[PDB]
């Protein structure tokens, strides 16, 4: 049935896969991305405080499970920077660094599995409850701001490994500032040989990337820069023996063999539930953002809910099979697309490459210096750092879009990454109220010899109809802008009905005494409700007050243009039973003007 095929997209998209013009492309993309996953897999595993094999496990299992339940065709899932940074925070906070080392590592990976499990369960839940429409409220400025800020954190983290300092740091409030001043303090303790292999690594990377970009193809596969750099670096650090002589930090023992089946011990559930909710929300945000981007660019659609189910299932299975939270990334996805990725066959291929490296290659990465991994991560961070080109573009067009970018960026750098995203999303939603809270009110006049009405301040051609005042608000009438609407009505019509009623009563009861009225220039006030999208409870109450106050000073209020929803809420709310009738609701400003002039004339006789 359609439910089982929608709950397992693999069973629907796999038979349709045309083996001739795609298979070659997806194999190329898979080999390219597997060659890129290995070094970054290890790197991001260190950045989360776990041993280095966990990167390879997280690069193998999640892409398989995603290929099965996933809806996107250009996303690459795996161990990503920001989730790795949040996992790391939790690990070292629940397990301080103080036989002993293996005991600490066992408790560390137990914490990591609990995190993966809980994050998977939260993502799965949001997907089953059909709450995936709320990932639409993640603006493009918000995600540009957020990923740029997170790239700053990832850049500062890899400075320490790049020089060879032994600095402790945090990801908490203002932690970037103390972290960079910590690097400025310990710069005299710079290892020279570490900086040497770092700069050698950077030189080899930029040479290989520029060369294989500009020079002739003569290749079905582009030159894997990161892989050959890792290979040359491990060979150099094994021959010249950097590790023991010069004290260059190297990757530890990488064990051979498939992952062991594990159980996330839920004794830690109340300690790590906060950071698991943060990991889940960050995972959804960046996974679905990537999916949507590539889907729009290649002309297809992803299901947000099925994406939350896919990411959730992926993380839960990984949790049991010795992994830490995986997620989509923009960097791998860009590489998987530019290599010629067409389907999730590319993901399956990449995972087979990491599989053969888990089984066979394995301990050849013993003599790999940590400085080469840090340099790889930096050169890959180019992409997200070039998103500072988005701050001026937003500035030129919309200053509130610019402020969403800036607020999220500064929130992420100068506070926590989770707090930065929460503050950004808050401000993102407030900008909608800020746009609608002082709407554009107008008094309309008829264009001479035409049955259309437009603003009199903007079109001096239009003349007001005698005895009829037409007023148009260009917004919803809700809690944010209802007091404003009532004020601007009483200001642009030049009549305050309560002041006029007070004046008339005072005049009539004073002449009653000496024996024993304020000139309103209209008999009808038409309200053009064409641009009134919706009305809330506070609007239906403000509209009832306007219609009553004008009923007391003898003015009829007609509505002209109300859409079906507004007329239904006005009916449920009791607008139509205390002055106004459903027969005072016209189709346009013209029909109301006519009925008004007519009523006046058929009363004079």
Ligand X SMILES: CCCCCCCC/C=C/CCCCCCCC(=O)O[C@H](COC(=O)CCCCCCCCCCCCCCC)COP(=O)([O-])OCC[N+](C)(C)C
Ligand Y SMILES: O=C(O)c1ccccc1O
Ligand Z SMILES: CC(C)CCC[C@@H](C)[C@H]1CC[C@H]2[C@@H]3CC=C4C[C@@H](O)CC[C@]4(C)[C@H]3CC[C@]12C
Give the nearer residue to a second copy in terms of CB position, either 256 or 457: 457
User: From a second copy, ligand Y, ligand Z, none, which one binds at residue 133 (CB under 5 to 8 Å depending on kind)?
Assistant: a second copy
From CA 443, how far away is CA 22, in angstroms rounded? Answer: 62
User: From ligand Y, ligand Z, ligand X, none, which one binds at residue 202 (CB under 5 to 8 Å depending on kind)?
Assistant: ligand Z
Closest CA to 374 of 282, 251, 213: 251
How big, in percent rounded to 5, are the helix, strand and coil portions of the chain?
65, 5, 25
Least distance CB 401 / ligand X (angstroms):
8
Give the nearer residue to ligand Y in terms of CB position, either 81 or 109: 81
Give the nearer residue to a second copy in terms of CB position, either 182 or 293: 293
Exactly one of 391, 419, 430, 447 binds ligand Z (CB under 6 A); that residue is: 391
- Choose the binding region for ligand Z from 355-363, 388-396, 454-462, 557-565 (rule: CB under 6 A): 388-396
- Using the structure block, give the residue that is written with the tokens 């609701």: 585
Pairing of strands 467-473, 522-528: parallel
Label each residue of 322-372 as H, E or C: CCCCCEEEHHHHHHHHHCCCCCCHHHHHHHHHHHHHHHHHHHHHCCCEHHH
- Choose the binding region for ligand Z from 69-77, 182-190, 375-383, 422-430 (rule: CB under 6 A): 375-383
The footprint of ligand X on residues 388-407 (CB under 6 A) is: 398-400, 403, 406-407
Residue nearest to ligand Y (CB): 150
Question: Is residue 94 helix, strand or coil?
Answer: helix
Give the nearer residue to ligand X in terms of CB position, either 30 or 420: 420
Exactly one of 418, 535, 542, 562 binds ligand X (CB under 6 A); that residue is: 418
Query: Does 94 participate in binding ligand X (rule CB under 6 A)?
Result: no
Give the nearer residue to ligand Y in terms of CB position, either 164 or 411: 411
Q: What DSSP element (H or E) covers 471?
A: strand 467-473
- Choose the binding region for ligand X from 95-103, 333-341, 425-433, 588-596 (rule: CB under 6 A): 425-433
Q: What DSSP element (H or E) covers 484?
A: helix 482-492
User: From ligand Y, ligand X, a second copy, none, which one binds at residue 92 (CB under 5 to 8 Å depending on kind)?
Assistant: none
Query: Does 278 participate in binding ligand X (rule CB under 6 A)?
Result: yes
Residue 595 has phi, psi (to 5 degrees) of: -55, -30
- Choose the binding region for ligand X from 124-132, 256-264, 469-477, 542-550 (rule: CB under 6 A): 124-132
**Structure tokens of 562?**
């109300």
Question: Is residue 165 helix, strand or coil?
Answer: coil
CA distances from residue 117 to 63, 122, 266, 516, 564 in whole angstroms, order as listed:
16, 9, 9, 89, 47
Q: Taking each helix axis from N to C terminus, what angle separates 269-298 and 81-94, rounded to the nearest 10 degrees?
A: 180
DSSP state of 136: G
Give the nearer residue to ligand Z in terms of CB position, either 572 or 582: 572
Query: Does 274 participate in binding ligand X (rule CB under 6 A)?
Result: yes
Least distance CB 411 / ligand X (angstroms):
5
Bin 599: left if φ > 0, else alpha if -120 < ψ < 50, else beta.
Answer: alpha
From CA 404, how far away is CA 517, in angstroms rounded? Answer: 53
Give the nearer residue to ligand Z in terms of CB position, either 303 or 536: 536
Give the nearer residue to a second copy in terms of CB position, either 413 or 566: 566
CB atoms within 10 A of CB 191: 18
Give the nearer residue to ligand Z in terms of CB position, either 382 or 499: 382
Pairing of strands 441-446, 585-586: unpaired
User: From a second copy, ligand Z, ligand Y, none, which one binds at residue 382 (CB under 5 to 8 Å depending on kind)?
Assistant: ligand Z
Residue 159 has phi, psi (to 5 degrees) of: -60, -45
Question: Is residue 508 helix, strand or coil?
Answer: helix
Max intra-chain CA distance, the chain: 120
Exactly one of 119, 151, 284, 384 binds ligand X (CB under 6 A); that residue is: 284
DSSP state of 66: H
User: From ligand Y, ligand X, a second copy, none, which one binds at residue 170 (CB under 5 to 8 Å depending on kind)?
Assistant: none
Chain Cα centroid distance, residue 28: 31
Give the nearer residue to a second copy in terms of CB position, either 193 or 538: 538
Least distance CB 336 / ligand Z (angstroms):
14
From CA 376, how far away is CA 39, in angstroms rounded? Answer: 8
Query: Does 85 participate in binding ligand X (rule CB under 6 A)?
Result: no
Residue ranges that bind ligand Y, judged by CB under 6 A: 81-82, 147, 150-151, 154, 286, 329-331, 384
From CA 444, how far away is CA 452, in angstroms rounded? Answer: 10
Exactly one of 38, 250, 378, 535 binds ligand Z (CB under 6 A); that residue is: 378
Q: What DSSP element (H or E) covers 455?
A: strand 453-455
Closest CA to 542 of 461, 594, 486: 486
Residue ranges that bind a second copy, judged by CB under 8 A: 133, 136-137, 139-141, 296, 299, 394, 396-398, 400-401, 426, 428-430, 432-433, 435-437, 439-440, 451-452, 454, 458, 474-476, 478-480, 483, 498, 530-531, 533-534, 536-538, 540, 563-565, 569, 572-573, 587-588, 590
Least distance CB 422 / ligand X (angstroms):
4
Give the nearer residue to ligand Y in terms of CB position, either 145 or 304: 145
List of residues 6+ apart from 277 with CB closer than 8 A: 118, 122
Pairing of strands 467-473, 441-446: antiparallel
Residues in contact with ligand X by CB under 6 A are: 126, 131-132, 134-135, 137-138, 173, 270, 273-274, 277-278, 281, 284-285, 398-400, 403, 406-407, 410-411, 415, 418-419, 421-423, 425-427, 430, 434-435
Q: Which residues bind ligand Z (CB under 6 A)?
A: 202, 206, 209, 378-379, 382, 391-392, 395-396
């Amino acid at each position: 049935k359609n439910l089982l095929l929608s709950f397992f997209p693999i069973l629907e998209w796999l038979p349709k896969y045309n083996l001739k013009e795609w298979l070659l492309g997806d194999l190329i993309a898979g080999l390219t991305v597997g060659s890129l996953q290995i070094p970054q897999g290890i790197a991001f595993a260190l950045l989360a405080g776990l041993p280095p094999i966990y990167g390879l496990y997280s690069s193998f299992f999640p892409p398989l499970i995603y290929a099965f339940f996933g809806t996107s065709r250009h996303i690459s899932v795996g161990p990503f920077a920001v989730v790795s940074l949040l996992v790391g925070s939790v690990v070292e906070r629940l397990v301080p660094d103080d036989n002993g080392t293996e005991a600490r590592d066992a408790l560390r990976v137990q914490v990591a599995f609990t995190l993966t499990f809980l994050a998977g369960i939260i993502q799965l839940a949001l997907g089953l409850l059909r709450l995936g429409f709320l990932v639409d409220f993640l603006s493009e400025p918000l995600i540009s701001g957020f990923t740029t800020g997170a790239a700053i954190h990832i850049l500062l983290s890899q400075l320490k490994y790049l020089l060879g300092l032994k600095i402790p740091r945090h990801s908490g409030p203002f932690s970037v500032i103390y972290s960079v001043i910590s690097v400025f303090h310990n710069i005299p303790n710079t290892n020279i040989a570490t900086l040497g292999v770092s700069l050698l690594s950077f030189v080899l990377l930029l040479v290989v990337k520029e060369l294989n970009k500009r020079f002739k193809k003569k290749l079905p596969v582009p030159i894997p820069a990161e892989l050959i750099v890792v290979i040359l670096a491990t060979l150099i650090s094994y021959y010249f023996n950097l590790a023991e002589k010069y004290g260059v930090s190297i990757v530890g023992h990488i064990p051979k063999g498939l992952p062991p089946p594990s159980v996330p011990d839920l004794s830690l559930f109340p300690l790590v539930i906060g950071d698991a909710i943060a990991i889940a929300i960050v995972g959804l945000a960046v996974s679905i953002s990537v999916g949507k981007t590539f889907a729009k660019k290649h002309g297809y659609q992803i299901d947000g809910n099925q994406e939350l189910i896919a990411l959730g299932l992926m993380n839960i299975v990984g949790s049991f099979f010795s992994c830490y939270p995986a997620t989509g990334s923009f960097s791998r996805s860009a590489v998987n697309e530019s290599a010629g990725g067409k389907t999730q066959v590319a993901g399956i291929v990449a995972a087979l490459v990491v599989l053969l490296v888990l089984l066979f290659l394995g301990p050849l990465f013993y003599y790999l210096p940590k400085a080469v991994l840090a340099a790889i991560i930096i050169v890959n961070l180019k992409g997200l750092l070039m998103q500072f080109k988005d701050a001026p573009k937003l500035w030129k067009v919309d200053k509130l879009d610019f402020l969403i970018w800036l607020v999220t960026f500064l929130g992420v750098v100068f506070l926590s990454v989770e707090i930065g995203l929460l503050v950004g999303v808050g401000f993102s939603l407030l900008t909608v109220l800020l746009r609608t809270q002082r709407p554009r009110t107008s008094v309309l006049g008829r264009i001479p010899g035409t049955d259309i009405y437009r603003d009199v301040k903007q079109y001096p051609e239009a003349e007001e109809v005698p005895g009829v005042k037409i007023f148009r608000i260009d917004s919803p009438i809700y809690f944010a802008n209802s007091e404003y609407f009532k004020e601007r009505l009483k200001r642009k019509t030049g009549v305050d009905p309560v002041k006029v009623l007070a004046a008339r009563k005072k005049a009539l009861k004073k002449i009653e005494k000496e024996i024993k009225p304020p000139k309103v220039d209209f008999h009808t006030l038409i309200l053009d409700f064409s641009a009134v999208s919706f009305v809330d409870t506070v609007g239906v109450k403000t509209l009832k007050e306007i219609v009553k106050e004008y009923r007391e000073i003898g003015v009829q209020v007609y509505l002209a243009g109300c859409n079906a929803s507004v007329v239904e809420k006005l009916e449920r709310g009791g607008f139509f039973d205390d002055g106004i009738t459903k027969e005072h609701l016209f189709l346009s400003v013209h029909d109301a003007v006519l009925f008004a002039q007519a009523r006046k004339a058929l009363a004079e006789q």
